[PDB]
Amino acid sequence: MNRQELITEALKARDMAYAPYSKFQVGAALLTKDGKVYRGCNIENAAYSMCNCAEQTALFKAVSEGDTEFQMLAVAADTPGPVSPCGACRQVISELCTKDVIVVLTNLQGQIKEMTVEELLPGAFSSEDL
Amino acid sequence: MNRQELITEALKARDMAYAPYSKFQVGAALLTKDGKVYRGCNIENAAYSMCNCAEQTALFKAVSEGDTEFQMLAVAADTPGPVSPCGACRQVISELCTKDVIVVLTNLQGQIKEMTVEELLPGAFSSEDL
Amino acid sequence: MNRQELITEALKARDMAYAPYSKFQVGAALLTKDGKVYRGCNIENAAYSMCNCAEQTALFKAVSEGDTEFQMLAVAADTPGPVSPCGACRQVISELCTKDVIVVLTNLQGQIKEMTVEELLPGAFSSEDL
Amino acid sequence: MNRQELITEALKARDMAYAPYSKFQVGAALLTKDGKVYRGCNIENAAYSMCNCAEQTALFKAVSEGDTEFQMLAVAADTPGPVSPCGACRQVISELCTKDVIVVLTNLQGQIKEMTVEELLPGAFSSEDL
Ligand SMILES: O=C1CCN(C2C[C@H](O)[C@@H](CO)O2)C(=O)N1
Ligand SMILES: O=C1CCN(C2C[C@H](O)[C@@H](CO)O2)C(=O)N1
Ligand SMILES: O=C1CCN(C2C[C@H](O)[C@@H](CO)O2)C(=O)N1
Ligand SMILES: O=C1CCN(C2C[C@H](O)[C@@H](CO)O2)C(=O)N1
Ligand SMILES: [Zn+2]
Ligand SMILES: [Zn+2]
Ligand SMILES: [Zn+2]
Ligand SMILES: [Zn+2]
C-alpha cells in the first residue's frame, strides 16, 4: 500500500461524500500500521457548523474500531492545488496521529504535497498544555 | 435486533470511547433498514471544541459506507437518567435520519427513554430553511 | 425593551452578518436583566464546520463582558416560518441561559414563536450529567 | 498600543473566561487598524464540542460590530510555553484576518512568540479552494 495506492483509496472515498450545500466533495484514506485502510468523506448539514470533514470521518471510524496505530493519511478534493486540511482537521489529526505519520495531500489533477503530522500543525495545542 | 439488543451494542461501543479529558464515555449503535449495526463512541481532543460524540461517530461511519436508511439509534452513557444527546448531535441526527427513526436513550442502570427523531428536535433547522 | 423592540435589534444585527457561503444572514439580540442589549450575527468560514451562529455570537459577547443574567433572546432570519435555532445553538443557550429565559423566534415577515430555554431543548445535556 | 500593552489586555480578558470543565482559562485581545481593542475569553459547555475559544470570541465580537480591519492579535494562557491556538482557531483567524496581521502568543510567565497569520497556518484552506 504505497502512497499512490492510498491516494486511489481517497479518490474512491470522495464519491461517498454527502455535501449538497457546498457541492465540494472530499475524500480521505487512513492506513494503519497493520495495513488496514479506513475511508472517509465529508458529511454536511443545513447548519453549517455541524459539517464533518473527510479526514475526521476516517479517523473516527478507525479509532471506534480499536485501531490507533497509523502510518499514512491521504486526502483528496477538486481544489487548484493539493487540498489543504482545515484547521479543525489538523487539530484532530495532531491528537489521534503520532507526529511522524505521513500526510499525503492531493487534488484531482495529480498535484501532491507530502508532510508529517508535526509539519501539518507545528507545536499543536495538546494535552500537555492542559 | 430489538431495542434491548441494540442497547447492548451501544454498551459495547461505549468501551471503545477515547475520552481522557472528560472521563465521560458514551456509546451509540445505529441500526439500518437492512439490519446492519454501526457502533460509535465519543472521541475527544485537547482542544475541547474538536470532541466528537458517539452518535455522530456511528452516523458518519454508516453514511461513509453508503448506508443512509436507518430504523433505530441507541445511545448509552453513565448518566443519572437516560443519556441526553447534546444539541449538536440532535442536529446531525435530524439531518441524516428520517423523522420517524426511533431513538433509544439509556444509561448504565436500565433507564430507558424512547422518542422519534422529530421529537428529539422538533422543527429542526433544515435545508428547506435555506 | 419589549419583545417587539428586541426583535428590531435582531433585525439590525442581521445586517452585520458575514455569510458569503450560505448567503443566509441571521441576527440575534440578547437582553440582560439590567436591560442591556447585545447584538449577534452569523459569521462563516470556507471550512463550514467553523461557522458561528448569531445566537452564539451574542451570548459570547455578553459573557465576555461579565454579563451572565439574561431575560430574553430574539433571533431573526429570512426563513419560511420563525427561524429555528440549530441544535448546537440550543445547546449553548441551554448552558449560558437560565431555563426561564424567553426565546423569541421570528422571520422577516412577522411570524413569531415564543418559548422558554427549557422548551427550546427540554432535558438538555448538562454539567449535572457529567 | 504596542504588543506589551495588547498582552495586558489579553491577560485581563482571560479573567472573564467561563471554563468550569477544563479549568483552563484563555484570554485574547484583538487590535483594529483604528486602534480599538476587543477582548475575548474561552466559554465552555457541558457538551465539549460546543466550547468556544478566546480568539474566536474576540474576532466574533469585532466582526459583529462592523470592524473587519485588524493589525494584531494577542493570546494568553497558563501554558508551559507561549499558548498555541488550536487548529479551529487558526482556521477562523486565517479567514477573518489578512495574512499580514501580527499574532502574539504568550503564557503567564513572559514567554512570547510572534508570527503572522500566514505563518500561523500557511496555505490555509480558503474560499479560493471552493
Ligand atoms: O479539511 C478538509 C477541507 C474541508 N473539507 C470540508 C467540510 C465541508 O463539508 C466542505 C466545505 O468546507 O469541505 C473537508 O472535508 N476536509
Ligand atoms: O450527545 C452525547 C452527549 C455528549 N457526549 C460527549 C462528547 C464529549 O466527549 C463528552 C463530554 O461532553 O460527552 C456524547 O458523546 N454524546
Ligand atoms: O441557529 C441559527 C440557524 C443557523 N444559523 C447559521 C450558521 C450558518 O452561517 C448559516 C447556515 O447554517 O445559518 C444561525 O446563525 N443561527
Ligand atoms: O486556541 C486556544 C487553545 C484552546 N483554548 C480552549 C477552549 C477550551 O475551553 C479550552 C480547552 O481546550 O481551551 C482557547 O480558548 N484558545
Ligand atoms: Zn477539515
Ligand atoms: Zn453530542
Ligand atoms: Zn446555530
Ligand atoms: Zn481555539
The CATH number of whichever domain residue D3 belongs to comes to 3.40.140.10
For D61, the grid coordinates are 465580537
Distance between CA A78 and CA A74 in Å, rounded? 14
For C48, the grid coordinates are 463550514
Parallel, antiparallel or unpaired: strands B26-32 and B37-41: antiparallel
DSSP symbols for C80-121: SSS----HHHHHHHHHHS-TT-EEEEE-SSS-EEEEEHHHHS
Instruction: List, in order, residues 6 or more apart from A69 with CB less than 8 Å away.
Output: A32, A33, A34
Distance between CA D20 and CA C31 in Å, rounded? 24
Q: What is the DSSP letter of B49?
A: G
Distance between CA C73 and CA D119 in Å, rounded? 39
Alpha carbon distances (Å) from D41 to B26, C64, C93, D18, D38:
28, 6, 17, 8, 10
| Secondary structure (3-state) at D104 | strand
Q: What is the DSSP letter of B33?
A: T
**What is the nearest CA distance from A74 to chain D, expressed in angstroms?**
16
Instruction: List, in order, residues 6 or more apart from D122 with CB less than 8 Å away.
Output: none
When CB atoms are compared, the residue of B24, B77, B91 closest to C88 is B91
Alpha carbon distances (Å) from C49 to A104, C88, C95:
22, 11, 21
Instruction: List, in order, residues 6 or more apart from A43 with CB less than 8 Å away.
Output: A17, A18, A19, A51, A52, A57, B59, B60, B63, B64, B96
For B104, the grid coordinates are 433509544
Q: Cβ–Cβ contacts within 10 Å for residue A15, how many?
A: 11
Q: Cβ–Cβ contacts within 10 Å for residue D5, how many?
A: 12
- Contact state of C52 with A49 under an 8 Å Cβ cutoff: yes
Distance between CA B9 and CA D31 in Å, rounded? 52
Nearest to B62 by CA among A50, A76, A60: A60
Which amino acid would we find at residue D4?
Q
For C120, the grid coordinates are 427550546
Distance between CA C4 and CA D94 in Å, rounded? 37
Nearest to C130 by CA among B80, A62, D37, D2: B80
A1 Cβ under 8 Å from any chain B Cβ: no
Distance between CA A108 and CA B1 in Å, rounded? 42
Distance between CA C31 and CA A64 in Å, rounded? 43
Cell 458569503 found at: C20
- Contacts with A, D 71-110, CB within 8 Å: 77, 79-81, 83-92, 94
Alpha carbon distances (Å) from C39 to B23, C6, C54, D109, D129:
36, 10, 8, 36, 31
Buried b (16+ CB within 10 A) or exposed e, C96-126: bbeeebbbbbbbeeeeeeeeebbebbeebbb
What is the domain extent for residue C14? 1-130
Distance between CA A68 and CA A96 in Å, rounded? 7
Instruction: List, in order, residues 6 or more apart from A66 with CB less than 8 Å away.
Output: B16
Phi-psi region of A123 (alpha: psi -120 to 50; beta: other; left: phi over 0): left
* CA torsion, ordered B5, B8, B9, B11, to nearest 10 deg: 160
User: What are the beta bridge partners of residue C39?
Assistant: C29
B12 Cβ under 8 Å from any chain A Cβ: no
Nearest to B101 by CA among B122, B121, B120, B116: B116
Does the Cβ of C22 fall within 6 Å of ligand 3?
A: yes
Cell 457548523 found at: A49
For B52, the grid coordinates are 466528537
Distance between CA B38 and CA B84 in Å, rounded? 20
If DSSP states are collapsed to H, E and C, what string results for C30-91?
EEECCCCEEEEECECCCCHHHCECHHHHHHHHHHHHCCCCEEEEEEEECCCCCCCCCHHHHH
Q: Residue B91 in contact with residue A47, Cβ under 8 Å?
A: yes
Instruction: List, in order, residues 6 or more apart from C106 with CB less than 8 Å away.
Output: C7, C10, C74, C75, C76, C82, C83, C112, C113
Alpha carbon distances (Å) from C98 to B5, B53, C118:
38, 25, 8
Q: At what angle do helices B54-65 and B87-96 cross, to 10 degrees?
A: 20
Nearest to A47 by CA among D79, C3, C21, B63: C21
Instruction: List, in order, residues 6 or more apart from C8 with CB less than 8 Å away.
Output: none
Largest CA distance in chain D: 41
Q: How many domains does chain D have?
A: 1
- Mutation site, C25, C42, C49, interface A, largest A CB count within 10 A: C49
Alpha carbon distances (Å) from C99 to A123, C105, C116:
41, 16, 7
Nearest to D50 by CA among D90, D19, D25: D19
For D59, the grid coordinates are 474576532
Q: Residue D107 in contact with residue D27, Cβ under 8 Å?
A: no
Q: Residue C31 in contact with residue C103, Cβ under 8 Å?
A: no
User: What are the beta bridge partners of residue B74?
Assistant: B29, B104
D46 interaction partners in chain C (CB closer than 8 Å): 95, 125-127, 129-130
D63 interaction partners in chain C (CB closer than 8 Å): 16, 18, 41, 43
Instruction: List, in order, residues 6 or more apart from A92 with CB less than 8 Å away.
Output: A55, A56, A59, B45, B50, B52, D87
Q: Resolution of this PDB entry, in A? A: 2.0
